[PDB]
Symmetry: D2
Amino acid sequence: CPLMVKVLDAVRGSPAINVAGHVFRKAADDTWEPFASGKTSESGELHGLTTEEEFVEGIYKVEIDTKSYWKALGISPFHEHAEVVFTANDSGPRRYTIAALLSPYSYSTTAVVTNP
Amino acid sequence: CPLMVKVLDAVRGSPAINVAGHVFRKAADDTWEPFASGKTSESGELHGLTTEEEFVEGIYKVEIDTKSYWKALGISPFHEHAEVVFTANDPRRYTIAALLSPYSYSTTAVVTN
Amino acid sequence: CPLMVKVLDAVRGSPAINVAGHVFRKAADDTWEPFASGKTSESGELHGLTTEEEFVEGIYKVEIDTKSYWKALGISPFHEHAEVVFTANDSGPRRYTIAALLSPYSYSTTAVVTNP
Amino acid sequence: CPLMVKVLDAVRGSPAINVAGHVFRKAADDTWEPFASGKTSESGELHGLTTEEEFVEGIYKVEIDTKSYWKALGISPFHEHAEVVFTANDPRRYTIAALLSPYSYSTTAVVTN
Ligand SMILES: [Mg+2]
Ligand SMILES: [Mg+2]
Ligand SMILES: [Mg+2]
Ligand SMILES: [Mg+2]
């Protein structure tokens, strides 16, 4: 799949399981249209969000519901979510892994971009 | 000022200077209304964004224009921007720190009294 | 394998390929004894460093030669290396993934620890 | 002072207070010789570690006792400590920033003139 999301929990040293992720694509009228969504697996991965044919050029937003994740663990975190906004496939189709590392008051996000 | 932003450059090991940051407050219709903005200083800071009286409880978004920063340095970046969305909750000072790399960023909140 | 190392390059958005990694284990006389070493693959992973039987309890150090990595890319980085020091298998055998995210003047390291 | 250390806590969103930090300088026989140490302040900083005259070129190691910090908070940590090893190279001020989580840490150098 050309778009995968991987989420890790920096407090427990584990995948972040059952984290909701929502993908949006910017429309011609500048609004965020829903594109795909899912939940992280026991491996912290969100697989199968899209296909090569559907994942056209565009500006995409991945919104990870980190607040609900921490709250279910008893923690009141700082952020409402972690959101990653990027232009995709501008120079041809690529494969994107969005990795997020979560702490209650901090997160990091990194992209690994590869050419199929 | 109850809200400060500090931006660092992980490639050059320096403050990220002249980066635009925009602050928005969520409105009743769930749209983002402009609240404050500025350009980071020589020390990578956005100062004077708001006041105690203005910075009431609510959901705020800080957008840092990282793409224009990397484009100025001649380095191809991944993100359009770095976004930090949080609820302000009543004394608390909020420092939003952002550490920038072309294909990665981290953001941390230091909330003090 | 109970000990894997994964290294990512935050400048290029890619695995960090051909990075040397050296593992040491603290000896009874408090010195760092060599334990294993290797180089990251095209996937940025260092596989096969040890075995379940050999990876006993102890204090381990993973030293990743980040300086040579950046230098070969034309960059003079801040750090001599990234080194991760931890107690392993204190409550029974575990599987450890040491992930490192590299920038010229910054690195992050995270451990994902799982129970087989 | 040409060398400052700042430590932040990513779980509580605060400076990491009362964290011990030790600075070592590599000796000719490749051993680590103690150079300076302290405990972080209320603001998470180690100040006054060295002077311009003392802080000559060489390889330095900063060891932050993160394990004792997390143990004080009652949180099981992964690392024995956070270690930052670097060559000081001739005006430059070095700020070593460390962002701590129980199973993760990041360190960044801000080098300014
Ligand atoms: Mg085109
Ligand atoms: Mg209230
Ligand atoms: Mg025992
Ligand atoms: Mg010289």
